[PDB]
Design a protein around this ligand. Structure first.
Ligand SMILES: CC(/C=C/C=C1/N(CCS(=O)(=O)O)c2ccc(S(=O)(=O)O)cc2C1(C)C)=C\C=C\C1=[N+](CCS(=O)(=O)O)c2ccc(S(=O)(=O)O)cc2C1(C)C
Lengths: 213, 211, 211, 213
């Protein structure tokens, strides 16, 4: 039900506008710095445009609504490094006379003066005569990108099971690398198509790699 | 602000309660208090609202309560899947201002020990042409989440160029981790083979690849 | 079903609490519990909802709470105007079925004693033509709500034909009552006068009318 | 906001249809026998027409909605004497993101085989030279009616203050009598107009009596 924009990278002291696409209760904004707890920012009511802010973010956060498209915008200025968090929109709704609140998928805003770098994608293939068991592992090395996150799908989403995308390592160089694997039946190894789809919103890079054949 | 314990742990079957202590001026002023569950890499999920009500579909093993100025979540017949972070949340009576609790890491003891399975990929041709080489070691499905990883050039230990992740919890309560070895194409083609060695507890799993 | 006490009484300034005890299978299953106030001859008014929330405009002297399987309404800085009936109310978790508590008569002690004022109307011409006659005695503004009423034909006591209401509470916490004397037009025109005598405590107020 | 129908009298074993005129939550029905506590009957949702009943009244109570007029009907059959109560409709609504529920004014249904009798209205006037104090009491004797309730207004509602309508007496004959008084300035006694308006819905009697001049 709720769709927010892609992840972003911002230089400290820049501005960031994050949108939320959508019952008539407020559109709330909640952040979570990685490893940290949740934190309320504020909300907005689509009509009258009344907005509320937690005292902390007050002034340097502007939450706006555009009724023409039922979409809400959270802006945060004076971006400092410690603003680095996942930013969710959330909105309450009523179904069974009962309550539920839908959360957005969240968008990661990383704040650093370190340059943005799109990933290099290399195929991780088995020797064919490497894999034993009617089953084989193959994948994508998504190497040397910055900042997080990266998104990997296989065969444009059509292939979804047996798919393990590992958390990234932060290399000494200050760039991330990460790996996605599919386990696949071994017999059709070099005949079936396996393409991985890499997306790294912060630099607007998309890469499709044919791992097989 | 709302104080919860940083972490709590319980055994399967038993019940536990996480406390959420605030003031007379918030938690004890109304019962606009709610509980949220967060599994790794996921949005928070509403479990309890208005102090004691369950959203539709939410299990009934989750109850809410409020003695004095402190809210309380109680999970009964505790199961492995309950392992997650829990957050309490307050609103002001005027419903114009909300705050979250610190968060609590709930851990369910008695999870079975599991040895890791390892996958080791050699550098691709594609990368070798870019005049680079990475060896990728993939460590998955282990518990508890503690491993030590050792790379070998032939059978000589190699420490330089190693980059290993902290192990982090998969969505089956088991852990995953990866380890990356960087070396130059010449460095890769000179040795007879390379091996990534995963040691977990009493276990050593070693996988090995060759140019 | 939900048990409340039939009545409670308190002094001005003090706080009181009315208990609403039910079961684990209702009141203790969620906090869809509410409180209602009813003044004499009026619809019930919602004071507390979701266990502890006030509707807009409702005074903050009214709070709600819930230890175990029993809800609780607490009124602070008790005032005369709080004198009324209080009802608690439960819903099932599925919100498809509701039940009320027994009701509680809250009384505020220390209300000042007040002597009644009396009005006595003679039969109208209109009624006299209908060959009937009623004397109307109107007793208002007294406390406590206990009076005895005595009619007199001249100064002889007359018991036959008397019809007197039970005193009932006006909306200022004082009581009102009426007393009706029936007699025939001839009976009315034969005596020199008639009187309704209201005795309250140390007080006797007598009003008297004549053909 | 909520308007229900007038009060009624029913012979035991008859049917009674009471309406409620009207946020989209259910329309609830609550009864109160005189001197008794409140009692939930059931409710209805204007769309889908889903209705709920307390087990007690189940079967012999039909609650209906007509969306064409946003009006709800509670019917109760097999009317027994002990059904004699005030019947309210109630409905929840949301204002300040906060809750409130509007109650109807209630309608009294009395169940008896005793005949319905509309009232006789007699004027209660002072001797003019009866009243001392720049103030005078006058009224209406509403005599010999059945069943309850009776409604008294003065000058069609225009006159509203200093108006005391006393609870009825149930006479030995089984009929009610009741009295309404206005206190009025004494100087304009026999010149000002004072009409009382009596309404006794159960027999559909309305009586206007000119008490002065
Ligand atoms: C709507 C509600 C409770 C309703 C309870 C009902 N109840 C339960 C009533 S009671 O609890 O017993 O008093 C009902 C019973 C029956 C019916 S029927 O007539 O149809 O049969 C209907 C109902 C209701 C009205 C559904 C609570 C809402 C809480 C909110 N809250 C408080 C949430 S929590 O309590 O902290 O979880 C809230 C906070 C913030 C924001 S915003 O600023 O982001 O827009 C908005 C909200 C909300 C207004 C959604």
């Amino acid at each position: 039900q709720l769709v927010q924009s892609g992840a972003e990278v911002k230089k400290p002291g820049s501005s960031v506008k994050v949108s939320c696409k959508a019952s008539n209760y407020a559109i709330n904004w909640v952040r979570q710095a990685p490893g940290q707890g949740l934190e309320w920012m504020g909300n907005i009511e689509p009509y009258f445009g009344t907005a509320n802010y937690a005292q902390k973010f007050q002034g340097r956060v502007t939450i706006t609504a555009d009724e023409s498209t039922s979409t809400a915008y959270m802006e945060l200025s004076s971006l400092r490094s410690e603003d680095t968090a996942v930013y969710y929109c959330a909105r309450y709704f009523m179904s069974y006379k009962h309550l539920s609140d839908y959360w957005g998928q969240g968008t990661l805003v990383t704040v650093s003066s370190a340059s943005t770098k799109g990933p290099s994608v290399f195929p991780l293939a088995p020797s064919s005569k490497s894999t034993s068991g009617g089953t084989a592992a193959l994948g994508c090395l998504v190497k040397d990108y910055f900042p997080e996150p990266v998104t990997v799908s296989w065969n444009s989403g059509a292939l979804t099971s047996g798919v393990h995308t590992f958390p990234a390592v932060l290399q000494s160089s200050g760039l991330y690398s990460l790996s996605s694997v599919v386990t696949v039946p071994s017999s059709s190894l070099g005949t079936q198509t396996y393409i991985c789809n890499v997306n790294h919103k912060p630099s607007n890079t998309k890469v499709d790699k044919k791992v097989e054949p | 602000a709302l104080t919860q314990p940083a972490s709590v742990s319980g055994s399967p079957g038993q019940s536990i309660t996480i406390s959420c202590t605030g003031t007379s001026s918030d938690v004890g002023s109304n019962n606009y208090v709610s509980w949220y569950q967060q599994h790794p890499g996921k949005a928070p999920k509403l479990m309890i609202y208005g102090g004691s009500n369950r959203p539709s579909g939410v299990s009934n093993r989750f109850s809410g309560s409020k003695s004095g100025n402190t809210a309380s979540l109680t999970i009964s017949g505790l199961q492995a899947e309950d392992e997650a972070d829990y957050y309490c949340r307050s609103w002001d009576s005027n419903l114009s201002y909300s705050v979250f609790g610190g968060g609590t890491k709930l851990t369910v003891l008695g999870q079975p020990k599991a040895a890791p399975s390892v996958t080791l990929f050699p550098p691709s041709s594609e990368e070798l042409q870019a005049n680079k080489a990475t060896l990728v070691c993939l460590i998955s499905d282990f518990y508890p989440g503690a491993v030590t990883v050792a790379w070998k050039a032939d059978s000589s230990p190699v420490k330089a160029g190693v980059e290993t992740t902290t192990p982090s919890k998969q969505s089956n309560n088991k852990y995953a981790a990866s380890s990356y070895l960087s070396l130059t194409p010449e460095q890769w083609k000179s040795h007879r083979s390379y091996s990534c060695q995963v040691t977990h507890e009493g276990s050593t799993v070693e996988k090995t690849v060759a140019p």
